[PDB]
Design a binder for this molecule. Structure first.
Ligand SMILES: Nc1ncnc2c1ncn2[C@@H]1O[C@H](COP(=O)(O)OP(=O)(O)O)[C@@H](O)[C@H]1O
Ligand code: ALF
Length: 953
RNA sequence: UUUUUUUUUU
């Protein structure tokens, strides 16, 4: 107990590429380096999560005098020792890659082998395919930019050549726009009222200076309070200046937003301010939803990812790019900042404007070669802030007789009872009793307005919604309407936070950080902040993904406070101590220090931005060099990069897809094998954190009806596919029947819809790349068939390639073994999870992702056959003693070594087939006869019972 | 609240 967890956390996957530096020597080497260099820095530990789910973050930064650099590591672990070991490993690998320390020169339980026997006919088919394919048998550039030019659509990056915009010049378009604007300003009463409102905004007093700075400088930073008018006013200022200058058709403005909801809402706001419908002067572009404006004199409110996607076609005809909320420090935002700095360096005429309420303006200006910072004084309306001391003192709230602690630190101005209750309340726990007391006090305030409560995640949001709906006062929908605000609730529900509620009804919005910034809900008067931010951690050396609830930053608190006091005076209720608030950090750590970088590297290569190392070095905070090395090695070994680090056709195709490169490679292979529909639906399932099966209150495992969806296939992916098929059938008959079906069978309609949208988008992208429509014909799956099913079997075999190295072997009950026989458990939400002594037809499973919890869990399990594992879910196949064939250095199979060598010879054949498919996507269904024979023999190897010849199991 | 679901992709 807990030794299995320690060994699982200490597992190392990639010590080979980091100079042979691993967990069990990293700390010793780091201590040697510290003693030699007189480095006095010591580990600092951040307790993470509640008492029952406590984890740790370990931090350590070492300054290198030789490089004039501070090398930092930021790692997590189930306990202090594991977290510190991971942090030392990260920092030592960084020092190794930075050529500060030497490569490692020193030095440092087998499974029951599994019988695999093939039919003589199948062996002959394999041999003939080897003979046919002659397989050996083992015995910089910058983004294009241009000023506006006639007969060109900026947003589509293409010529117009249609309609009557052929002889229409930009000068005539400017004249028409100027005349229309003047006519509106002279006649439209609603437009005049909106200008009257806009002139009273705090940013309106500085419009002339803002426009002067924008005109005179290529890059300008704008800092103003939340709700001052940056987003809704700067683009309008620039466009109106151009239009009234007589150069209206020479303007095209990009305004990037961090959130889809924020982009859409602000675009709607600007459109209704201009008294015109979306698509005339204001447009937006988010995922699955785009309303494009006119090609000239327009504003497009997109997200950063949408802009990065548009970057491939160039930015011809773009005059101004406005980046919002540069404080978010997202990986896409940092990418965009690097691209934009290079672009303004190349093209002096392009204008880039950065605005944020909470930024280090000096840091950003130093990054942008000393650029103006324009400060917008004042606020629209004041916001009153209270802290935990104030809330307890004014609620007279004592914690119920239930079970550096900054809740013990308090000022002497507060009552002894208040400090007692504060010390008795726990920091890591969210008290629903305290929240209810605060809500009752707000009710007693007799002040109309919506309440916005910031909760870190789905579980807390819906637990609080259940608690409040079971309450007599807050369960009355005639008085209170509680609305979730999550990125994975249905989009109609996401909208409903903006719609007004009936008279006499108070709106309560329980939200994650989507409602944190950039949105204006017009009736928010009260903001309740729990001060917790949900973070997703990933440890590279053991492939563990962990969800952490950490303390939010002062930037996050100020942005959340800024949701109120925009249209009327507001209040902010911060549910943390004043001591805790002062203890908080200014900003959260950037995602660039904790996320994998292979997708970013693929985007770098797609946009022809040069070397990955140089590009990432030019960042605001350059990423860890060991992470850069891991990304490059991954892309090179998946062959998205040529031996000269150049993008291959496969690399280009995968760079254009919004999924992981391994999933994209899996989907290309599935297109070759005729199951692209299933491969796309399963890649969409593998790329979402939304849950397919809804678990009821107190449901620690799936229900019988939910489990029966997998039938006899023993696969979460098959269960998902069957659910998707039935949900499509019931959706074709109507939305109400769709909702009834999901609520009956225990599905999540939002998950079904997002999975379908992502799958459809992948299929359209494949069609655009040139793959034929015949290779993506939908195939129905009958999970109730107990036997073989060739299409589903090849699909599950391709899951092994698309989910590598996530192969686990069942031991008993929930216990499984991951790579190198590390203990793990089956996740509670899997169809394969059961309390009884379940026996599976095969013990080998492929799973989506590996989660670190109180125990290591495997999730999204799919039962696969030994031949499928050998062919696709492995990279190394070796001959061990007693003629036992070993795959991935830990899985033993009792198969003939000659047969194993023959089957392993097909892996380069599959690689060459993928290369051929990417070379000519249109002819993948009519290949040469060797490759057609390879496809057929791979199908015959991937049938479920291909390795069951003469074997009972 | 007995951690299944921070955010983002023409
Ligand atoms: N949908 C809306 N309904 C009512 N008022 C709004 C709306 N959107 C914006 N406003 C008002 O316009 C002002 C400007 O908002 P915005 O430009 O988004 O500010 P910033 O970009 O500085 O956060 C806000 O203070 C708000 O009062
Ligand atoms: F600068 Al903003 F909403 F775009 F505050």
């Amino acid at each position: 107990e807990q030794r299995d967890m320690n060994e699982a956390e200490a597992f190392d996957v990639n010590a080979a590429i980091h100079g042979n530096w691993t967990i069990e020597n990293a700390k010793e080497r780091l201590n040697i380096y510290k003693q030699t260099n007189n480095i006095r820095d010591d580990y600092k530990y951040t307790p993470v999560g509640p008492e029952h789910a406590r984890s740790f973050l370990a931090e350590l930064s070492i300054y290198v005098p030789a490089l004039n650099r501070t090398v930092t590591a930021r790692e997590s672990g189930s306990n202090k020792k594991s977290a510190s070991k991971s942090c030392a490993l990260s920092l030592v690998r960084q020092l190794f890659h930075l050529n500060v320390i030497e490569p490692f020169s020193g030095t440092l339980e087998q499974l029951k082998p599994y019988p695999v026997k093939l039919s003589p006919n199948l062996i002959n088919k394999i041999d003939e395919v080897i003979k046919g394919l002659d397989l050996p048998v083992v015995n910089s550039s910058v983004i294009p930019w241009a000023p506006p030019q006639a007969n060109w659509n900026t947003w589509h990056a293409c010529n117009i050549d249609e309609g009557e915009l052929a002889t229409t010049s930009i000068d005539d378009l400017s004249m028409d726009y100027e005349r229309s604007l003047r006519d509106r300003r002279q006649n439209d009463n609603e437009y005049r009222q909106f200008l009257e409102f806009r002139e009273k905004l705090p940013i309106a007093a500085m419009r002339s200076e803002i426009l002067t700075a924008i005109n005179d400088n290529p890059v300008v930073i704008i800092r103003g309070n939340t709700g001052c008018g940056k987003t809704t006013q700067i683009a309008q200022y620039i466009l109106d200046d151009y239009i009234c200058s007589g150069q209206g058709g020479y303007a095209n403005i990009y305004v990037t937003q961090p959130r889809r909801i924020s982009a859409i809402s602000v675009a709607e706001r600007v459109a209704r301010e201009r008294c015109e419908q979306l698509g005339d002067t204001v447009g937006y572009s988010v995922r699955f939803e785009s309303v494009f404006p006119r090609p000239y004199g327009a504003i497009l409110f997109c997200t950063v990812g949408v802009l990065l996607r548009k970057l491939e076609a160039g930015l011809r005809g773009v005059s101004h790019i406005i980046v919002d909320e540069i404080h978010e420090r997202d990986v896409n935002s940092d990418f965009l900042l690097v691209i934009l700095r290079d672009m303004v360096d190349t093209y002096p005429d392009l204008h880039v404007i950065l605005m944020s309420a909470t930024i280090d303006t000096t840091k950003f200006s130093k990054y942008f070669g000393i650029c103006p910072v324009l400060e917008v004084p004042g606020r629209a309306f004041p916001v009153q802030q209270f802290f935990l001391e104030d809330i307890i003192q004014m609620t007279d709230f004592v914690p119920s007789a239930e079970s550096i602690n900054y809740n013990k630190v308090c000022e002497d101005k507060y009552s002894q009872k208040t400090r007692n209750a504060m010390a008795m309340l726990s920091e890591s726990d969210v008290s629903f009793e305290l929240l209810e007391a605060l809500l009752m006090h707000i009710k007693s305030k007799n002040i109309p307005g919506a309440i916005l409560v910031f909760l870190p995640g789905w579980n807390l949001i819906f637990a609080l919604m259940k608690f409040l709906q079971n309450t007599n006062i807050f369960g009355d929908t005639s008085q209170y309407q509680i609305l979730p605000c999550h990125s994975q609730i249905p989009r109609d529900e996401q909208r409903k936070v903006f719609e007004p509620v009936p008279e006499g009804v108070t709106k309560i919005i329980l939200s994650t950080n989507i409602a944190e910034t950039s949105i204006t809900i017009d009736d928010i008067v009260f903001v309740i902040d729990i001060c917790k931010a949900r973070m997703k951690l990933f440890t590279s050396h053991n492939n563990l993904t962990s969800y952490a609830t950490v303390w939010a930053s002062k930037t996050n608190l100020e942005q959340r406070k800024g949701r109120a006091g925009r249209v009327r005076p507001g209040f902010c209720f911060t549910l943390c101590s004043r001591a805790r608030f002062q203890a908080l950090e200014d900003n959260l750590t950037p995602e660039m220090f904790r996320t994998p970088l292979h997708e970013m590297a693929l985007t770098i290569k797609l946009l022809r931005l040069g070397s990955i190392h140089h590009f990432l070095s030019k960042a605001l905070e350059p990423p860890p060099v060991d992470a850069v090395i891991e990304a490059e090695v991954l892309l090179r070994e998946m062959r998205c990069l040529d031996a000269n680090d150049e993008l291959t056709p496969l690399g280009r195709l995968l760079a254009r897809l919004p999924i992981e490169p391994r999933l994209g490679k899996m989907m290309v292979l599935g297109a070759v094998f005729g199951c692209a529909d299933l491969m796309a639906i399963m890649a969409s399932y593998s790329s979402t954190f939304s849950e397919v099966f809804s678990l009821d209150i107190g449901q620690r495992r799936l229900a019988n009806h939910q489990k029966a969806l997998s039938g006899t296939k023993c696969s979460d992916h098959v269960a998902m596919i069957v659910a998707s098929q039935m949900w499509r059938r019931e959706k074709q008959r109507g939305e109400h029947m769709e909702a009834r079906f999901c609520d009956w069978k225990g599905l999540q309609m939002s998950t079904m819809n997002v999975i379908w949208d992502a799958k459809q988008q992948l299929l359209d992208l494949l069609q655009q790349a040139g793959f034929p429509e015949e290779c993506m014909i939908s195939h129905e799956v009958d999970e109730r068939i107990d036997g073989d099913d060739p299409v589903l079997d090849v699909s599950l075999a391709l899951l092994c390639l698309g989910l590598y190295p996530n192969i686990c072997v069942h031991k008993e009950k929930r216990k499984v073994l991951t790579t190198e026989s590390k203990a793990a458990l089956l996740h509670k939400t899997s169809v394969n999870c059961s309390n009884l002594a379940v026996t599976f037809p095969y013990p080998f499973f492929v799973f989506g992702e590996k989660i670190r919890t109180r125990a290591v869990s495997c999730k999204q399990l799919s039962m696969v056959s030994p031949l499928q594992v050998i062919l696709f879910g492995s990279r190394k196949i070796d001959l061990a003693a007693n003629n036992i064939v070993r795959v991935d250095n830990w899985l033993n199979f009792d198969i003939e070594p000659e047969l194993a060598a023959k089957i392993g010879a097909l892996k380069p054949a599959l690689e060459d087939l993928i290369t051929v498919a990417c070379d000519n996507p249109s002819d993948i269904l009519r290949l040469e006869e060797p490759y057609a024979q390879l496809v057929k023999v791979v199908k015959d190897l991937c049938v479920k019972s291909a390795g069951d010849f003469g074997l009972q199991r």
